[PDB]
Design a protein around this ligand. Structure first.
Ligand SMILES: [Mg+2]
Ligand SMILES: [Mg+2]
Ligand SMILES: [Mg+2]
Ligand SMILES: [Mg+2]
Ligand SMILES: [Mg+2]
Ligand SMILES: [Mg+2]
Ligand SMILES: [Mg+2]
Ligand SMILES: [Mg+2]
Ligand SMILES: [Mg+2]
Ligand SMILES: [Mg+2]
Ligand SMILES: [Mg+2]
Lengths: 76, 177, 51, 136, 117
RNA sequence: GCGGGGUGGAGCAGCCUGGUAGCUCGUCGGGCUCAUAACCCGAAGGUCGUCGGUUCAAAUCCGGCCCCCGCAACCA
RNA sequence: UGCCUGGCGGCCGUAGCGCGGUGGUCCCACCUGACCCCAUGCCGAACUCAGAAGUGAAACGCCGUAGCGCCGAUGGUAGUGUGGGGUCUCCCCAUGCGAGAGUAGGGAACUGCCAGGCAU
RNA sequence: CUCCUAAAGAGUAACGGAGGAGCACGAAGGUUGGCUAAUCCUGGUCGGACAUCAGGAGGUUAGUGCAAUGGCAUAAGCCAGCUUGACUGCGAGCGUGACGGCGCGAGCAGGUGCGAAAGCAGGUCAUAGUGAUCCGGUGGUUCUGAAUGGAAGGGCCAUCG
RNA sequence: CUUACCAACCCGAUGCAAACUGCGAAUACCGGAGAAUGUUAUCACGGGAGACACACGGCGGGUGCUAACGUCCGUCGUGA
């Protein structure tokens, strides 16, 4: 019938890009699905928010037999 | 294990030369006999399906497995998940002791017997045939009969083609019209 | 808009309670669960009661 | 009048018409009518040019229509102010870029194909040219 | 559908978890005739110790090389081979096999021999 | 521009609350009558305006389009 | 040291699929038996246990093969940052960046740890 | 709330283009173990285009309590066993908002479930399912109590309209 | 039985898409390092505001008729 509705933007996306130094608990990326997967020292929240489980620099890699993007923390 | 013993000694070496097999493992085998009883009308009342499966339990001595509807279809007006029919699969010697029980007792009983068909093969060497009457088995007594429901019988063989398939049951003296 | 709010009272002497919802049309049976009672600091059984 | 049998959506954005065309060579017949200009081709213009060519060769040989009007164009009716939602779909167009082959013909002599294409070009809003099949 | 590929699927989840935990795992492979045991480094590419029934040093003292008591011999052997090497706490990786029978007899034997898991 | 409707041949229920087509007339068949009406008795006829979506299932729900009925179309 | 097999990895199609061939001392697979441990919403099929008569048929591994997938330049083209211009719905010039597709071609994976067998 | 417009970080308007929500669930939650679709072909009692059975093809074209999008094979999909972590107190550190707020969260303490164990569990694949404050109700409460002891009332905690 | 015609799937060839993607830039943005340059140009706290009617031009778009010195956003410039 009639349009005119929308929802508030959710501010998704990457918060800390490759090489950035983060503290433990820092949110790395907010996402709906697991577009990015948790690697080493990275947790996956209930809404699939990837957060650093240790200090260090974030690192993006593509691994596995399905070429999936992983995010890990190079502990430094 | 009558025909089971008759299998490993007689029908193997006639078949081994009939197809000129290199290894004995190439000869076809008989894995399982599965008896299906599609009730279909149990949706009206389910008191008749248990005694329906009670018959199939007496034909093979195994408690049947009640199959459920895989998906809802209104063409036969059933919703997915309804108890729609029972089945029993037979392996090992219980398959054999049943496999002779029909070929020597299940064959000489069917009304107006004319012989089985040679075209009822899956195309890869597996046979299937349906019996219309359940009073053809010695177990099920005529006195206790609430309905005349039949059932399907399919023969799962390791054969690769129908020629190797028909050759195996022919070795067991199967009636081929 | 059918689920009614209920409370689960601890079987212990303490008046502590949880609150939850329940569809009283499909599930007429009372709800009983083992939940942590922070007053006695033990896992006791909680029974249903009116809110 | 050509028109999609069904669509995922009824109305589309205006968009732009930049770039050069794809399908720039005669691929089915032997002669083609290639557009050298840029613009839109309504479904009526396509049908009008087809009838002009179909009658030109007295319904002989084969004719291909390489374009298809898949873009809906909306219009607001008269005496209607701005706003109150997008207008209703009135006709369909095919976006044309320079080099697009519009029609192809086969089974007729070249001198007859030129006159057929010349009669059809007079119905189209864009400048066209005559092309022939070449060895790729 | 081979039983092997269906078994690797059963073992993938626990192995990913052990890899994420950075733990040194005790991998067990079971065949109808033999049984095997490996202790892999946390990186998953170094074999620290190993023991199995295809080693004649252990096979000669067994009636049959693929029964339940044969697995207890490998479980006892792999643990004492690892204790003197320096590893004390590991994680048992059943690797798609049910924790029952032979692999269970291998585990508790290694548990009895002083391997903490 | 908003609301309500299109169902046997005719006029109307049922849609709201998805599964099950009902009422009165007419029509067909047999009776009563010398004959017709009235009357009594029995039986048929709709796939629900059309196309599409939702559902296991659509007269019913939700569209689009064909239609008829409406109400409103104001201050210069 | 070489060959061969098993396990765990790296890597994630140049590594896949098909087609052809091939392997059983060991290994592996099928296999044998099943009262019992255990198991089937029925079935020792699977899972599990006890075994070693048979077989490499299947599966798996290996070898070959360009049928397909896959990889893939060079050049050109599209686009585009900045500056300028035109006939300005679209383009052009200077300069920087520069695809996608396609073409030549490549290509029948490579590799680590441990273990066993065999030759040495 | 979801997608597009939105110009490859975030955000971004219109009486712009399309759809949804005002819930549901003590299992549809937790855990352990297992499992892998759609569709089609062939054969087969009643049985039919479509029921259950068997085989092959196929490879997720299926499924997900519901819109869309992003996800999902280690399945987040399907089945069974046992269960109540749909725990209490907290919380490094971040995300997002003018603010009120909203969101994610390892780890710590107490107590608990499942598992042989490593471990996992502070609801559900994620994102909608909602309403500030005042006033008042109900339960609790080593708080207060207008001379004093009580009480009323108030506070604090839990919760309701 | 053969018969104005329509025709799924598959195969070959050819296009189209804001709400298609087995591809994929230039830019922009985030972070790190390094010089030179810039009157700290940056951040925080505090005192005082004003402003919340914008306009046109370029570029990228929605809307409209790729109509409007139209309208609504993004970004830059100028006017203000
Ligand atoms: Mg076996
Ligand atoms: Mg390229
Ligand atoms: Mg953005
Ligand atoms: Mg705890
Ligand atoms: Mg326990
Ligand atoms: Mg959900
Ligand atoms: Mg007092
Ligand atoms: Mg204002
Ligand atoms: Mg304003
Ligand atoms: Mg403005
Ligand atoms: Mg203006």
């Amino acid at each position: 019938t009639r349009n005119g509705r929308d929802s508030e933007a959710k501010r998704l996306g990457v918060k800390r890009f490759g090489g950035e130094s983060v503290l433990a608990g820092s949110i790395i990326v907010r996402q709906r699905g697991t577009k990015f997967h948790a690697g080493a020292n990275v947790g996956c929240g209930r809404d699939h928010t990837l957060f650093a489980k240790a200090d260090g620099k974030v690192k993006f890699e593509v691994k596995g037999p399905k070429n999936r993007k992983f995010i890990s923390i190079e502990a430094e | 294990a009558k025909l089971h013993d008759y299998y490993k000694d007689e029908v193997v070496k006639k078949l081994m030369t009939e197809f000129n097999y290199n290894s004995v493992m190439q000869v076809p085998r008989v894995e399982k006999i599965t008896l299906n009883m599609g009730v279909g009308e149990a949706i009206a009342d389910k008191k008749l399906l248990d005694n329906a499966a009670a018959d199939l339990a007496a034909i093979s001595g195994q408690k049947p497995l009640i199959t459920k509807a895989r998906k809802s279809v209104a063409g036969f007006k059933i919703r997915q998940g309804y108890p729609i029919g029972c089945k029993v699969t037979l392996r090992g010697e219980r398959m054999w002791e049943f496999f002779e029980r029909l070929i020597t007792i299940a064959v000489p009983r069917i009304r107006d017997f004319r012989g089985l068909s040679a075209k009822s093969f899956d195309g890869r060497g597996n046979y299937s045939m349906g019996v219309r009457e359940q009073i053809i088995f010695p177990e099920i007594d005529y006195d206790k009969v609430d309905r005349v429901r039949g059932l399907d019988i399919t023969i799962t063989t390791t054969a690769k083609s129908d020629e190797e398939g028909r050759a195996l049951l022919a070795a067991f003296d199967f009636p081929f019209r | 808009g059918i689920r009614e709010k209920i409370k689960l009272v601890s079987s212990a002497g303490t008046g502590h309670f949880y609150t939850t919802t329940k569809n009283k049309r499909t599930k007429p049976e009372k709800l009983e669960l083992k939940k942590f009672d922070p007053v006695v600091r033990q896992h006791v059984i909680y029974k249903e009661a009116k809110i | 009048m050509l028109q999609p049998k069904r669509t995922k959506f009824r109305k589309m954005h205006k968009g732009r018409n930049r770039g050069l065309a794809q399908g720039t060579d005669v691929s089915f017949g032997s002669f083609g009518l290639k557009a050298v200009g840029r613009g839109r081709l309504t479904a009526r213009q396509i049908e009008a040019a087809r009838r002009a060519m179909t009658r030109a060769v007295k319904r002989q040989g084969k004719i291909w229509i390489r374009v298809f009007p898949d873009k809906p164009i909306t219009e607001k009716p008269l005496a209607v102010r701005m706003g109150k939602g997008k207008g209703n779909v009135e006709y369909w167009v095919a976006l044309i870029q320079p080099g697009k082959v519009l029609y192809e013909m086969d089974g007729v002599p070249e001198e007859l194909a030129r006159e057929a294409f010349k009669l059809a070009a007079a119905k189209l809003p864009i400048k066209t040219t005559f092309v022939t099949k070449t060895v790729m | 559908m081979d039983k092997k590929s269906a078994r690797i699927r059963r073992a993938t989840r626990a192995r990913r978890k052990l890899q994420e935990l950075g733990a040194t795992r005790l991998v067990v492979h079971r065949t109808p005739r033999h049984i095997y045991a490996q202790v892999i480094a946390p990186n998953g590419s170094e074999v620290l110790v190993a023991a199995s029934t295809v080693e004649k040093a252990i096979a000669e003292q067994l009636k049959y090389t693929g029964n339940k008591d044969a697995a207890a011999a490998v479980g006892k052997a792999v643990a004492e081979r690892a204790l003197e090497k320096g590893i004390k706490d590991v994680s048992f990786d059943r690797s798609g096999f049910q924790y029952h029978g032979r692999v269970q007899a291998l585990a508790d034997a290694a548990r009895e021999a002083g391997l903490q898991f």
